[PDB]
């Protein structure tokens, strides 16, 4: 989730 979220942002 960490990288999914930061990628999205
Ligand atoms: Co990763």
The pair of three-digit structure tokens given for residue 9, joined into one six-digit string? 């942002």
Give the experimental resolution in Å: 0.9
DSSP string, 1-9: -HHHHHHH-
Could you give the CA distance from residue 9 to residue 1 in angstroms, rounded to a whole number?
Answer: 12
Instruction: Give the Å distance between the CA of 8 and the centre of ligand 1.
Output: 13
Could you give the CA distance from residue 3 to residue 8 in angstroms, rounded to a whole number?
Answer: 8
Which experiment gave this structure?
A: X-ray
Could you give the CA distance from residue 7 to residue 2 in angstroms, rounded to a whole number?
Answer: 9
Could you give the CA distance from residue 7 to residue 9 in angstroms, rounded to a whole number?
Answer: 6
Instruction: Give the Å distance between the CA of 5 and the centre of ligand 1.
Output: 11
Tokens 């990288």 belong to residue: 3
């Amino acid at each position: 989730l960490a990288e999914a979220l930061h990628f999205a942002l």
